Structure formats: C-alpha cells, structure tokens
Design a binder for these strands. Structure first.
Lengths: 702, 123, 185
RNA sequence: CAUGACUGGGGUGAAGUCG
RNA sequence: CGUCACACCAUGGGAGUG
RNA sequence: GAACGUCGUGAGACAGUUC
RNA sequence: GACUGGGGCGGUC
RNA sequence: GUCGGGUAAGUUCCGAC
RNA sequence: CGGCCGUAACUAUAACGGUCCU
C-alpha cells in the first residue's frame, strides 16, 4: 500500500539525451536517489557500485528504501519519503509519445551536455513540449568536460532552445579540475570528496576569480526571482533584496508555471554535484498533490468531460505508460494510479478502445528484484501481468467506467525504415519476423503484399523503430534495398486503333466453326474504375449472330485481360465491334471459343496503356535550417514540395513523394537532412502522373 | 458360408476410409494459406468459386474452400480448416473456418450468423 | 558463281542464321530477371506493336533483383505485365519509378530451366550458321569447277568461309555473353 | 522410413489434334 | 475408344543420397 | 598395334574420336 | 615431265 | 555436352539423358 | 529403308495438315 501521501510521492522525470552519458548517468541515478542499491557503500570509488554487479541495473526507479541517501528533515532535500522517477525523453524531435511520457511524471529535469551546450536533439523536443506544458529545471551535466562554467552553457539554452535560462549556481573548477559546486540559494560552497558520491564533503572556498562570477549569478537569481510576483518586482526594481524565503517562493512558483529554466551544475560522469541537484527536484518540482487528477471525456461519443481525483474510495483509474514482455506470464503493462485501487484477480476496463480486461497478477518491479504484490492504492505505481487491450498510453479503470484518459493512442505515425527481402530465403525469414513483431507490439506498422511489396517497418518509440528493424536485418537476415510497399492498380488504357481482325473459318473443331470479328478500340476516360469498359455495336447481328454477340465478345474480353497490357485488365477502354463474318443464323459453344481465340491472338498487339503509380503524402518535420535539405532529399528521392510552412523549431514541408520511390525513406531522409528530420507517410492518391506531380518531382530532381 | 467355412475364414470387417488428410481425429486444423485461387466448378454448374492451398500444421498441404459472400484472405494469412468436402470443386474436401485465426468473415450477413463471420448485427 | 557473289550471298545468309541465334538466346524468356525476359511482352503503343526499348529501360544490380526503370508512373505498369506473368514470372515491388523485384521460387530455380535452354538454343543458332557454311561450301564447289580451282584450293576457300562463319561464331559467343550478364542480373 | 537426375503406367480435369 | 499435346494429383522403377 | 566416322579405286590419310 | 621464292596441292607450259 | 552426386571449390570419377 | 513448308492455351516442341521424290 502506502503511508506517505500524494504530496510525499514525487513523480519526477529525467529528460536526458545520450550526449550527457547515457550509461553512466543511469547507473549513478539508480544509486543516488534514496537507495535502490546495497546498504551503505558511498565512500571511495568502486565500492559504491557493488550493488549492480550482484543484481539488476537500469529501469525507472521507485525510491525510498530507507537506508542510504536520505536527509535529516522530512521532505527537506533528500527523501524521508517516496520519490518515483518515471523517465522523460529529450531526444531527436518531439512526438506524441514524447508528450505522453512528460505527462506521467509531474515534474522534469532537463539534462544538457556542458561541452555541447544545447545539442540539436534537445531543442526540437523542448519548444514543442513547452506548448503542451512541461515544467523543467536544467542540469548542466558533464562538468568534467568543457563548458563547465555558466556562461558557455547558458547562451546555448537561450539561443538554440528558446527558453529563458539563468545562473543560480557557480561551479568550482572546470574540466578535470572541477570538483565542487556552489549553492547560491543555501549559500554553501561544496567540494565533493569522491568520484561516485562526495561523502565526507568539504565546504570549501570559492576561488578568487570566481567570487565575482558567484555574486553575478546570485544577482541573476534575484532578477529571475523578482519576475515571479508583482511585489518582488517592485523591490527588485528599486534595489531591495529578495530574502531566502522570497527567492524560495519564487523558485517554486516559476518552475511549476514553467516560466523559467533554472540552471544547475554537477557532473554525473565524474559523479560530483549530482546530489545537490536531485535535492532541488524533490523540493521544487511537482508532486501528485499538484496532479492527483487525470481528466477525460466520455468514451461513448464526447458527450461530457469527466474528472478523476485521487481517493481510494473513488473508482480505479490508472494510465498505462509502457509495455514490456516479461517471460514470467507475458506482457507487463506498467501504470501509474491516479485514483482508486485495484487488487489482483479483478476485472478492469480498457475504457478507450472499449475492451474488458482480466487483471491477473500484479507485480512491482524494483530495480534489483521482482516482488509480487496484491494491491495498488491511489498514487501507487505497478505493472499488471496480462491485459486484453491496455498497452502504452491506454487507460485502465475499474470493471466498467467509460472515460478517455488516453489522449494519444498506442497506434502512432508511420515513420519507417524499410526491411527488404531479395531472395525467397529472405522472404521466408521475413514472414516469421512479422508474425512475431505483431504479437509483442500491435501498434508497429508494416506495408506488404504477398511475396513482394514488403516491408516498410515503423516503430512506436525512440528505441523501438531501431530495435525492430535491427532484429529483422541482423538475426533473421534480409538483403536490403529491394521490396518495401503495398500497391493495387487498374488500367486506364486508351488508343484509337481501328483494326484488329480475328478470323477463324475452318472445319475445326467438331462441326464447321466460323467466327470472325473486327474490333476498333477507341479511348475511354481514364477513371479510377477497375471494371472499365464500354462496348458499342456499330454492326450488331450482321457480323456475328445477334444471339451470340455476348458469347464471342466475352471470350475475347477474358482472354485480352491475360494478354499484353499492364498486368491489370483492359479497363477504361472503349471497344467497337464494327465488322466480322460467319453464319449469323447458326452458333455453337465451340464456335465462340474458336472465334475468341483467333481474335485474342491478333488483339493484344495494338492499343496504348496508361495507368497509375502510388503517390505518398510525405509530411516531413525537421529543424528550419533544413528547408534546403528536405527539398534536396526530395530531389534524390524524385519528390516535390506542395507547400512548406514553419512549425515551431522546425519547418513542416508538405511534400508529395511517390510511395513507389522510397529506398528506406527514413535512412535517406536522415542522410540528406543531417539526422534532424522526422516524417509520416500516408497515401495521398494513386496518380496518372498529373502535371503538378510529375513536373514538380522532376523539377526537384533536376 | 457354412460354420466350417466360417470357423476357418470368418467374416472380414472393412477398414473405413475417412476421406480427410487432415485426420489426426480433429474438428479442425491450423494452416498458413499458400495462395488464393478461383477455380471453375464441374460440368453441371458454372461460376468461379474461391479456394486456397493450405499448409496444415502437420505439413499435410491441401486446398480448403472459402465459402461466404465475401472473401478476404491473403497469400500468407492464417486460416483454420474444418472439413466438409465440396462437389463442384474436386480435391477440395475442406473449408476455412469463418471468423477464426488470421482470417476474416462474411460482411453484412444477418442470417445464419453462427456460420460465417458475424456476431449480433448493428441491432 | 564467282567468289565475290558467293561471299555477298553468304554474308546475307549467315547474318540471318546469326539473327536466328540472337533470337534463340533471347527467346526462352532468358534467366528470369532480364531485359530479354520482357521482349516476350511486346507492348502495344500508339496502335503499334512496339518493342520493349520504347517503353522502358532495364538495369540490374544483382542476379536476384531486376530493376526496370520506366520514366513515367503509367509506363511502369505497362512494363509490369512483362516482369510479372508466369512464363516471364516474377513478383515486382515498387522501388524507384522502377520495380525492384523479389523472386518467388526458392532463391530462383525457374531461371535455371530457361538458362540451359538458352545456351542449347544458342548452339542451334551456331549450327545454323555452320549449315549455311556447308551451303556456301556447296556453292564454293561449283565455283571451283567453274574457275578451275582444284580440290585443295576449294577446301582452302571453304576453310575461309568457315573462318567467316567463325567471326559470326565469335559474335554468337559475344551475344550469349551479353545475355549471361542479363541472367547474372 | 525420408529423398533423387530421369523414367513407366494410373487419375482427374478442360476438353484440342487424329482417327 | 485409344494415342498424342498440355496443367495438376497421387504412385511404381532409379546412378545412388540421409 | 587396333578400331569408328569421314576421305580415297587403293597404299594410306585427318589441325576428328577411341583402347 | 617440267616450271615452281623447298617440294607438294593449285596454276602454266 | 546437359542434369544429378561427391567437393568450400571436381577439364578426372560415379549415375542419367 | 527421304526431304522442304505451315500449325494448339506463355513461349519452345507439333500429335495435325501440305507438298516434292521413292
């Protein structure tokens, strides 16, 4: 259950790119945050890390196991209480999945690489994410590298990323000589004694050269503080100091309303100063007392808004935010509970795609061990094993309770890389992989037809698109750059060609058999009709018996579709029977079969096909410097632009690129637009190559 | 015959020949579907029907009938064979279960819902 | 019969046998994934029964893919009935304004039964050029009596016709070798 | 018991050639 | 009625192979 | 040495093959 | 039989 | 010669045509 | 103890037809 309230639960996130040191930071975070490691072991280097060599590492951490990394006061700095770290992303570009993750955690820590300032991947996510409301503080990681002073990092946060950053800490040292962080809000300067933690820390000097910096950064804190409240702004403007309480109040207010991004420092790679930053997360970033609710609308229509609020007494409601497939009893669907309670062996509702769920066994996954539990309370987080239709983003509620708590579904945009077989051997291996992918992830995308036209593969998360594509090409093999997209066509063949004669006038077969037709094929409108097809009798029964004109005609029609054309039947062509001969007062089944046969042998040879190829709406969103480069990608990919409008950090080019002309589109697009693009690919139309589509694509291409 | 002639060579039985390769004494068998045909019936009837070769779980390949007023199978879709041969279609002594596995089921059908693919209409 | 008029006749005849050889190589729908694959599907254009070149270009990156480039979207389709079929049999995928084509047998096997036939048929073509040499030789025998060339002289002259044959044999090998690159495409 | 270049006859079909 | 074309189905024979 | 195909009335021969 | 850019075949006397 | 076999690869070898 | 030619469902082959001489 729980004993600590909603307020003394801290749903916090880490939004951190790869560049901050993905591996190192995650191991250190699991150690740092309120014990999720073996008892003690906090002084001198390697001994700190004995916990992970013995059992499980990485994850997302429920913390407060009450034996290491605590503080003396209740809800003051570290712990005495539960802190749940649900991860946030800040990699590549913003997506609905990125948005969805940011909302489960109530506060977030944006992490930057110090040397890189703000790298491309961080900015694109941030501006878009801000629009949909996300409160963040900034953690200048990797202070063991360059940029290990406030001025370099801070200019990038304003310029690249568009936030208002401001100093509130001064660093002690820079690069390898960095060893300390000065807290300009608690007015201590701290030297950390270990490269893991910093236990037996020495409150130390601020070097003479940095006294000035520290005072300026304190002043920058006051300026930032004063903006919070009109009263403070008066005091600041005249000169009057904003005391410890005033600044503290301002920090809480501005972070929760996302009016600022506080800048802090500490390396999590040299592993000094991280701890000071994490205390501030607990103090000032949101908790479930600020988000006890989850708000929907009815699942039946959109008739009325319905609001949930935390209370065990109130019915269950939880949002599932991740699916893993545990070999124990299958899929574990991690969820955060907002209201009510669920117990093992209950029925719950998937109240957004409208399915009943069997709540089997429920487990809480500590980052070291698996512990089966029987109950979750309001505010608790756990994973249920076995659910019918609750997956990532999907809503769990009590046995029955319609309510849309999923405001961005598990099916996600078609951003694809193409996995291509080349040999029948590769086609066989492909089939096994696709079946397997569907069962673990129902919200992946595939494009396929039988034996070829297969596959364009789309994921559902940052790891996911890469993981699925890699396993198919690596483990189960595939010989790239051949087949990849589903198709379907009709002919639209037209041409005014007066003649083809089929004349049979022999004694074969059986009795004497005679059938003779001359047909004129003349243009008929190139429709989207798969049937086609207009028949006119210029001369009716005088050229083949009136009673027999459909049988003869039907025999050629069937046969013609099989002959030289386009692989799609004679469709949207007009055919005129205008001459022929034969006994118009006699017929037999045999006569039409011979008549049709000879007619078909002549008939295939003359006409002029016109048909269609699929054109894909390719909407590409990339950072604005790539307006050039998207058009360049299109040129190499016989594609064109039909409008291009700015969208936040990026430009949104509304391009039309043939579906047919993809070469593993994400890979090509990334190469030409320097890794910064994202795209969706939806069918636009099949096209006759219209003037705008053909000219524009060719135009880009040269 | 006579008692004597019976005491020697009694009355022989008759090994009942169950016309069904997908035996294994089962109500149905899973397949994979090799392709989707449209072969023509016998001499008495006309109109092209729909069929498809199936790669039964026991290897035993065989073409199954795809009854219903609306096919929807693929060259890789997984269907379930049931039985009941078909006259007009020789060699085709099976039928793909309607509304099971990776197959589909008749659409807009309001009569004989059990059979085919339909479960309580739009009410 | 003078040497010059026999040679002029021989050059005509042998060329027709060499053309029968070109036909014979191209005419089994080649080793499934070829340009020569698709000339068993002469596509009707402008009311004419036009040869393959006027509707498409055919490139090959490896023996298991066949890329058929058609400049227009419509054109790719009308070529598509020649990559496809079942005697020209393949299963095309759209990649480019061209089809990149996955193979249905078991990493191909319909390509073999055709390629052996192609090489045998090629030799039937060569045999035809050599039978034309025989006919030319027959005429060379008549010419020999007329200009009073001895047995040794006519047999040397026949050997010369055989050398001329061998130029067309050399070209036959070259023709075959070009179809080999198609087969290996 | 599985399988094999090739090969023999059998069975269907759609019904063609030849009588 | 029986060749002889084709296309499928099962099956006997087979240098031998597992 | 011997043989086949081919050449020659033939002895033999072959920018053929075969033991 | 000879002539013969050895001879022979061819060709010529 | 062509197909099959043996071989990582077999102008020889074995089984076919 | 023969030749030349035309010919059926994707070609290739041609049971079939023709024709010249035994």
């Amino acid at each position: 259950a729980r004993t600590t309230p909603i307020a003394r639960y801290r749903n916090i996130g880490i939004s951190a790119h790869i560049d901050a040191g993905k591996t190192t930071t995650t191991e250190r975070i699991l150690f740092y945050t309120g014990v999720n490691h073996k008892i003690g072991e906090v002084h001198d280097g390697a001994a700190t890390m004995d916990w992970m060599e013995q059992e499980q590492e990485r994850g997302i951490t429920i913390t407060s196991a009450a034996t290491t990394a605590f503080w003396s006061g209740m809800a003051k700095q570290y712990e005495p209480h539960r802190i749940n770290i649900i991860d946030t992303p800040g990699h590549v570009d913003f997506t609905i999945e990125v948005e969805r993750s940011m909302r489960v955690l109530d506060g977030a820590v944006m992490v930057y690489c110090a040397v890189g300032g703000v790298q491309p991947q961080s900015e694109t996510v941030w501006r878009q994410a801000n629009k949909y409301k996300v409160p963040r503080i900034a953690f200048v990681n990797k202070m063991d590298r360059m940029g290990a002073n406030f001025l370099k990092v801070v200019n990038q946060i304003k310029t690249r990323l568009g936030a208002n950053p401001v100093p509130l800490q001064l660093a002690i040292g820079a690069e390898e000589h960095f060893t300390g962080v000065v807290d300009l809000v608690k007015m201590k300067a701290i030297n950390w004694n270990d490269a893991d933690q910093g236990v037996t820390f020495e409150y130390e000097d601020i070097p003479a050269d940095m006294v000035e910096l520290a005072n300026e950064w304190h002043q920058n804190l006051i300026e930032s503080a004063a903006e919070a409240s009109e009263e403070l702004m008066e005091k600041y403007l005249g000169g009057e100091e904003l005391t410890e309480a005033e600044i503290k109040g301002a920090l809480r207010q501005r972070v929760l309303n996302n009016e600022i991004i506080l800048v802090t420092c500490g390396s999590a790679f040299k592993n000094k100063g991280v701890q000071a930053m994490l205390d501030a997360v607990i103090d000032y970033l949101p908790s479930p007392v600020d988000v006890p609710a989850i708000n929907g609308i009815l699942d039946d229509g959109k008739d009325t808004p319905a609001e949930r609020h935390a209370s065990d007494d109130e019915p269950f409601s939880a949002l599932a935010f991740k699916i893993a497939t545990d070999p124990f009893v299958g899929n574990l669907t991690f969820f955060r509970v907002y209201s009510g309670v669920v117990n093992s062996g209950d029925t719950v509702l998937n109240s957004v795609k409208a399915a009943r769920e069997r709540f089997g066994r429920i487990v809480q996954m500590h980052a070291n061990k698996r512990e089966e539990i029987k109950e979750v309370r309001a505010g608790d987080i756990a994973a249920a094993i076995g659910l019918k239709d609750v997956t990532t983003g999907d809503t769990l509620c009590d046995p029955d309770a319609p309510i849309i708590l999923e405001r961005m579904e598990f099916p996600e945009p078609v951003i694809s890389i193409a996995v291509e077989p080349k040999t029948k051997a590769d086609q066989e291996k492909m089939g096994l992989a696709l079946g397997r992918l569907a069962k673990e992830d129902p919200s992946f995308r595939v494009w396929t037809d039988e034996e070829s036209n297969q596959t364009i593969i789309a994921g559902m998360g940052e790891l996911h698109l890469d993981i699925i594509v890699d396993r198919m090409k690596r483990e189960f093999n595939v010989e790239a750059n051949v087949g990849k997209p589903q198709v379907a066509y009709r002919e639209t063949i037209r041409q005014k060609v007066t003649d083809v004669e089929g004349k049979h006038a022999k004694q074969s077969g059986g009795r004497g058999q005679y059938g003779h037709v001359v047909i004129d094929m003349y243009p008929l409108e190139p429709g989207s009709n798969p049937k086609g097809y207009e028949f006119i009798n210029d001369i009716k029964g005088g050229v083949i018996p009136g009673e027999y004109i459909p049988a003869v005609d039907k025999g050629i029609q069937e046969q013609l579709k099989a002959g030289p054309l386009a692989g799609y039947p004679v469709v949207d062509m007009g055919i005129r029977l205008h001459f022929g001969s034969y006994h118009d007062v006699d017929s037999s089944e045999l006569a039409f079969k011979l008549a049709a046969s000879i007619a078909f042998k002549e008939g295939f040879k003359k006409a002029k096909p016109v048909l269609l190829e699929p054109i894909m709406k390719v909407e590409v969103e990339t950072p604005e410097e790539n307006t050039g480069d998207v058009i360049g990608d299109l040129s190499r990919r016989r594609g064109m632009l039909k409008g291009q409008e700015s969208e936040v950090t990026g430009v949104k080019i509304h391009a039309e690129v043939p579906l047919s002309e993809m070469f593993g589109y994400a890979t090509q697009l990334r190469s030409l637009t320097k890794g910064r693009a994202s795209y969706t690919m939806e069918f636009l139309k099949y096209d006759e190559a219209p003037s705008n589509v053909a000219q524009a694509v060719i135009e880009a291409r040269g | 015959a006579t008692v004597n002639q019976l005491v020697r060579k009694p009355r022989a039985r008759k090994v009942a020949k169950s016309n069904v390769p997908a035996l294994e004494a089962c109500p149905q068998k899973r397949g994979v579907c090799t392709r989707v045909y449209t072969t023509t019936p016998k001499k008495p009837n006309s109109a092209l029907r729909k069929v498809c070769r199936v790669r039964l779980t026991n290897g035993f390949e065989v073409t199954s009938y795809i009854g219903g007023e609306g096919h929807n199978l693929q060259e890789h879709s997984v269907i379930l064979i049931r039985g009941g041969r078909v006259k007009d279609l020789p060699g085709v002594r099976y039928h793909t279960v309607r509304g099971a596995l990776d197959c589909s089921g008749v659409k807009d059908r309001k009569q004989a819902r059990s059979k085919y693919g339909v479960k309580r209409p739009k009410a | 019969m003078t040497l010059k008029e026999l040679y002029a006749e021989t050059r005509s005849h042998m060329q027709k046998s060499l053309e029968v050889l070109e036909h014979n190589l191209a005419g089994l729908r080649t080793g499934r994934a070829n340009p020569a694959l698709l000339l068993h599907l002469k596509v009707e254009y402008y009311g004419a029964h036009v040869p393959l070149n006027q509707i498409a270009t055919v490139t090959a990156p490896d023996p298991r893919t066949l890329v058929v480039q058609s400049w227009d979207q419509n054109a790719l389709k009308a070529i598509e009935k020649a990559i496809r079929d079942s005697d020209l049999g393949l299963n095309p995928s759209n990649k480019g304004d061209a089809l990149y084509i996955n193979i249905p047998p078991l990493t191909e096997e319909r390509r073999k039964d055709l390629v052996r036939a192609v090489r045998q048929y090629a030799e039937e073509g060569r045999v035809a050029i050599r039978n034309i040499r025989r006919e030319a030789l027959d005429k060379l025998k008549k010419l020999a009596k007329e200009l009073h060339l001895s047995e040794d002289e006519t047999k040397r002259a026949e050997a010369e016709i055989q050398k001329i044959t061998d130029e067309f044999i050399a070209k036959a090998d070259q023709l075959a070798e070009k179809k080999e690159q198609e087969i290996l495409g």
